[PDB]
Every structure is written in C-alpha cells, then in structure tokens.
Amino acid sequence: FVQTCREEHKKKHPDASVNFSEFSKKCSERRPPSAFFLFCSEYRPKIKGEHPGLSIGDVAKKLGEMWNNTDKQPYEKKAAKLKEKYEKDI
C-alpha cells in the first residue's frame, strides 16, 4: 500500500520530500609508455590550459588528431630507450 499512499500524496503535499518515520506513521494509521603515450602525458597541460572542461574523449581525440597530423622523432627515441631499460629489468 505504502507506495500507492505516497504516490497519491505527491500532489497532496505540493513539492515536499516527506520523512521516513512520519510517513511510516501515516500509512500505518490509515611497461614503458608508447612514444605517443609519453607525448600525451607531456601535452595534457597545454591542451588543458587552453580548454579546461574538455572531456577525456575530447582531449584524447584532439591529442590524437593533432599528433597524428604531425617532428615526433624524439618521442620515439625516448620510447626506445625506456623500452630497452624495461627489457633489462628482470
């Protein structure tokens, strides 16, 4: 019953959110990073500062599109170095 009693009362009380106790009373009563990956970690601040509320999908989509359009050789160098370091790591 209680669910029907409240539903009815949704217009009885115009907009009030009723209490649990009282309502009961009333019802009762009724790896190393990719080159691109290290790049994105470094470039997240530039993209973020220029657009602060960009979602993850949006920021990543941008980062990806502009870096895909690109120059990026030092990223691949750093990636290869970190790769062989991790390889050594046993």
Partner DNA sequence: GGTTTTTGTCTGGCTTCACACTTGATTTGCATCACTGTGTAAGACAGGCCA
Partner DNA sequence: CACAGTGATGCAAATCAAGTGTGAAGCCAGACAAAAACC
Binding site for DNA (CB under 7 A): 1-3, 6, 17, 20-21, 23-25, 27-28, 31, 33-37, 40-41, 44, 55-57, 59-61, 63-65, 67-68, 83
Residue number, 6 or 78, with CB nearest to DNA: 6
Least distance between DNA and beta carbon 9 (Å): 10
CA distance 80 to 82: 6
* Rounded least distance, CB 4 to DNA, Å: 9
Distance in Å, CB of 33 to DNA, minimum: 7
Distance from C-alpha of 88 to C-alpha of 90, rounded to nearest angstrom: 6
d(CA 10, CA 3): 11
CA distance 82 to 31: 9
Cα distances from 72 to residues 33, 40, 68, 75, in angstroms, run 15, 12, 10, 6
Q: How far is the CB of 39 from DNA (least distance, A)?
A: 9
